[PDB]
Design a protein around this ligand. Sequence first.
Ligand SMILES: Cc1ccc2nc(C)c(-c3ccn[nH]3)n2c1
Ligand SMILES: [K+]
Length: 214
Amino acid sequence: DTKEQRILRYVQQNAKPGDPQSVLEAIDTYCTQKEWAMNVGDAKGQIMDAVIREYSPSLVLELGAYCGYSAVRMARLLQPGARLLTMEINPDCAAITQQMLNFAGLQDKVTILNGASQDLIPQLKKKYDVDTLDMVFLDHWKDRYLPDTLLLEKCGLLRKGTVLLADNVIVPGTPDFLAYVRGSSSFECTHYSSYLEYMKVVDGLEKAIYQGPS
Ligand SMILES: Cc1ccc2nc(C)c(-c3ccn[nH]3)n2c1
Ligand SMILES: [K+]
């Protein structure tokens, strides 16, 4: 039994359906209980929340779903009419994330895309009717942060003000991505520190707002 399975089972047994906050808490509670290092957790969750509230995106792209914690986190704050597109390379994680969202009552707002970002990002404009993204949450594989950022620019998916929020830019680290956005005039960058338990290490998120092409 994978951890994602066990998490979903726990949520379905303890949280309240259509109550996104209770789903998030049950995930946080269980993971804590089992001492599993969380992919996001509530503290980073609070940073994601503030970014969503601050920019009120109508169309969000999430790279990496895992058990669907961040998807529930983001979808619950989206306005009616808004969409979250979530890319997940692992079919089994995709399946869990769908169930998680169904249970939270948020499935209407989310489209799960199963596959690698390098395969799926170029399909956005036409297959999923995307003009430009309002926000991108990067939480997939470290070595695809910078290439996917370049790919999103190339596909014309970013506009001035598009908010890229990247997780784990310190641990395990995305230094090349950071060097790129902090040094590019195409981005305005803010850093948010946050602590990873068990490893007991300060990690961080980078917020990088697209300014348009150079
Ligand atoms: C290694 C690697 C390459 C490409 C890619 N695209 C996505 C969405 C993911 C992923 C990571 C976690 N969940 N999904 N991914 C992982
Ligand atoms: K910059």
